[PDB]
Design a protein around this ligand. Structure first.
Ligand SMILES: [Fe+3]
Ligand SMILES: [Fe+3]
Ligand SMILES: [Fe+3]
Ligand SMILES: [Fe+3]
Lengths: 210, 210, 213, 210
């Protein structure tokens, strides 16, 4: 038995204020340094308990520790995708090209219509959660869904390639209750290059994965 | 637009009575022909609604339809993994070798410790759900977790390689309320070569996705 | 400190085979002696942990232990209402009268419309759960809802007066996957006298719990 | 048939700035006028769909509409309890007497032990939700629990007599990520007069409902 590899906080791919005016520095700071850090620490702490259990040192509530692992792992991986999904206005914003634009044209009937559907998915998350654009390994097509918290409504298989955090902490300081305006403005920092790089990996690796 | 690719019910890799005496024919029949078919039909039905919305013919409750998609897609993919995860005793059962056994030693301290943990995870799912052995693309390590329903507690990233269905319909006609005995018996039909193939694909393809 | 009062498994109000042919003896036996008993034990086990935590004897995961309490307490109270909600065919079945019929006409446009809606609610629970007819203390009207597991989608305030268990263990041995047939057959053992009494209590007692008199 | 009685947004028992310095005016105002109002509308909108369905005027997804009703009704009743559970500091805060103090002594081993447990329950809500002190009709005793969102982990029977909102919108503008500090400060505005009156009604009324 070798000890588990610890999860690590991935640094932001841009400065804390690089997403202004659309997302303010203070949100980015809090979001990355308080919130994301906590998921990393929480996922590791769950695995530490599992380890002490396996080594016969303690007897854990397997369901409880696994619920802790699930929520914190999911928070960790969802944000790890969230950050590079965005970029400073210029590098971020506008409309996609390449392979992403092609499937969006094919599945959703154009960016316009995709954007409307994704925005509606994000805006209408009940409570806190995510709007998610995912690659389906079973059909090699794009799917849009919601995730509640970090780990509710998410499924096996589906590979998130573009996600928006619609937890209240993601916008409240700036947009107050107005999640709709947040989602509208988030489009101006979407890093279509990062998304494109993900659809590439998925088209190559996801079906041959399942 | 191109109309979404439909999901389809996979055939079982063996006859309905082939996992006897561990899982009786009537369960396998009902489970595949009734339950799994419902998920295929529901996942498609959800995507038909999204299509009509995209064609501008109807307006949908995006949240509601994506919850339907989520549950049925999850049910479909989880069962698609579940069937080939099992095999008629001989091909099914026993103790794993290869890379599966290798990381089972590294992560869990051996087959018996792993078996005990996986079994406890499976047995203690609250309500209906799944015990899941998954490959973590962020650490390239095994993780065990539970899923409730098909689409609760599941996270992005984690690739399920071995799953056990602990919904009541999976065992009740034979084991009645005794999920524990069903879980103990299920080990005798696990298709470890299938699990091995899945882990190999996961080691090859999963990490370069996130 | 004296701490907590324990939950106990109630007896059924009738023999295990008393709801036949609509619900078979085997289901009633397993459901009561194994499933319901398990919730009683689970709720008590959670309260024992909280106790030890409060005495400083251990330090629990409060979230985890409260999740266990929630699920098992909910299972216990839901089955506690479920059993007397039914009665052997004769006392059970048929159509309600009294205050329940009055509110069903007002809220739902009659019994046939109510039945169609309640049945749809029960039949379409995603995964395992309950169909629930409840009294709303804020409006003193009936409401129908679903509950998933025992403790998901349930809200504060609403007082369940008629519930149907649509967990798979409630019907599978007899109806197999055909939850629809089970739901249809279940109407034949509804104890409307029990539902009526619950509504009487709700009309008298529920509103003041929330809107102070 | 009679059209349903609509839910209405109650006024607060005090002005938006009356809970300062513990909860700032801007939070109280947004929380009441935006958040609570939205639940009232959401619960009414779900009931209207049910009505139109019953009148044979529209098609509904019964599950979806009932999920909408559940969430919004729950948000409404929980905030309806939340507001009078608080009072301007002076009338609010301090230490309970009467029947509430008596049960706190007998069950939790006194106020400080109760406060520590309730605070722990509130602080550790996973995602958004509520810390709840409820009266249990089966035992005529107090119980503590968490609720996630407004309508997850709540059970039948239990009557909330004291609740704390730990949705991020309840604290984020003032306390940022520091929910712990919010929970600690909230004790200074607890209206124990209100809690005592709720308990007295529950002692009188709750058990016979079941
Ligand atoms: Fe976040
Ligand atoms: Fe299944
Ligand atoms: Fe049951
Ligand atoms: Fe709130």
């Amino acid at each position: 038995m070798v000890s588990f590899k610890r999860y690590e906080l991935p640094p932001l791919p841009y400065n804390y204020n690089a997403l202004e005016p659309y997302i303010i520095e203070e949100i980015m700071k809090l979001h990355h340094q308080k919130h994301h850090n906590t998921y990393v620490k929480g996922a590791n702490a769950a695995l530490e308990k599992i380890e002490k259990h396996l080594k016969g040192e303690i007897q854990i509530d397997v369901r409880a520790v696994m619920r802790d692992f699930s929520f914190n792992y999911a928070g960790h991986i969802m944000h790890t995708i969230f950050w590079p999904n965005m970029a400073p206005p210029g590098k971020g914003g506008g409309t996609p090209g390449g392979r992403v634009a092609d499937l969006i044209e094919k599945q959703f009937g154009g960016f316009e219509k995709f954007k409307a559907l994704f925005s509606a998915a994000a805006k209408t998350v009940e409570g806190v959660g995510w709007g998610v654009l995912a690659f389906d390994p079973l059909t090699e097509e794009l799917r849009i869904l919601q995730v509640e918290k970090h780990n509710v409504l998410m499924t096996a298989g589906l590979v998130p390639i573009l996600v928006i955090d619609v937890w209240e902490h993601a916008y409240y300081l700036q947009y107050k209750n107005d999640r709709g305006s947040y989602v509208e403005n988030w489009w101006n920092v979407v890093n279509w290059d990062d998304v494109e790089k993900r659809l590439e990996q998925a088209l190559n690796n996801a079906k041959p994965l399942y």
